[PDB]
């Protein structure tokens, strides 16, 4: 409220940086989940063997 | 996974996920993390004549 | 328009309009607007700011 149309660009840049960091975190979480799925499949195959 | 080393020993392997200041999502103590960090690409700019 | 720069930057572009001394239509305080001000009238002169 009453920002002044000067620091709004900096606020947008900070919000975008946070959004990019969260997108990277979500990608890392998805990669971890895929790794757990692959590990579970491999462990099941090894136990069967 | 559970791995039995060839040299007569056993161990357990783990998958590590790092909760650093980039994927913390509202650190509960110091408020230092995704919040309060800028890492902004640039700064507010104005073109003058 | 909303413009995302090549080097991972985001900014908002705006179209500017000037109200200096020829498009203000009764300046509130200074009384020096396009109306409510005196115009020099001479054959071989020009008004410079």
Find the residue in B nearest to C12 (Cα): B44
Residues B17, B25 contacting (CB under 8 angstroms): no
Residues B22, A21 contacting (CB under 8 angstroms): yes
- Classify residue A13 by burial, with Cβ atoms within 10 Å: 0-12, 13-18, 19+: buried
Rounded to the nearest 10°, the torsion over CA A33, A36, A37, A40 is -160
DSSP tally for chain B: helices H, then strands E: 0, 2
Q: Chain C: nearest CA to B39, how far in angstroms? A: 11
- State whether residue B38 sits within 8 Å of chain C by CB: no
* Secondary structure class of A25 (helix, strand, coil): helix
Q: Cα dist. C3→B41, C7, C22, C27 in Å? A: 14, 12, 31, 35
Beta bridge partners of C12: C2
Compute the distance between CA of residue A18 and CA of residue B40 in angstroms, rounded to an integer. Answer: 9
Q: Chain B: nearest CA to C5, how far in angstroms? A: 10
Compute the distance between CA of residue C12 and CA of residue B46 in angstroms, rounded to an integer. Answer: 12
Find the residue in B nearest to A24 (Cα): B23
Q: List the one residue out of B16, B17, B12 whose CA is nearest residue B2.
A: B12
Q: Chain B: nearest CA to C48, how far in angstroms? A: 17
Q: Cα dist. A42→A38, A47, B4, B5 in Å? A: 6, 9, 16, 18
The coordinates were experimentally obtained by cryo-EM
Compute the distance between CA of residue B32 and CA of residue A47 in angstroms, rounded to an integer. Answer: 44
Q: Which residues of B touch C9 (CB under 8 A)?
A: 41-42
- What's the resolution in A? 3.5
């Amino acid at each position: 409220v009453g920002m002044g149309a000067a620091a709004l660009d900096a606020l947008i840049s900070g919000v975008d940086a946070a959004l990019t960091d969260m997108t990277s975190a979500a990608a890392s979480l998805g990669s971890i989940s895929s790794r757990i799925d692959l590990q579970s499949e491999f462990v099941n195959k090894l136990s069967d063997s | 996974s559970f791995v039995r080393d060839g040299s007569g020993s056993v161990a357990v392997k783990k998958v590590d996920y790092s909760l650093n200041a980039n994927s913390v999502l509202f650190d509960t103590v110091g408020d230092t993390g995704i919040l309060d960090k800028v890492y902004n690409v640039s700064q507010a700019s104005v073109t003058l004549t």
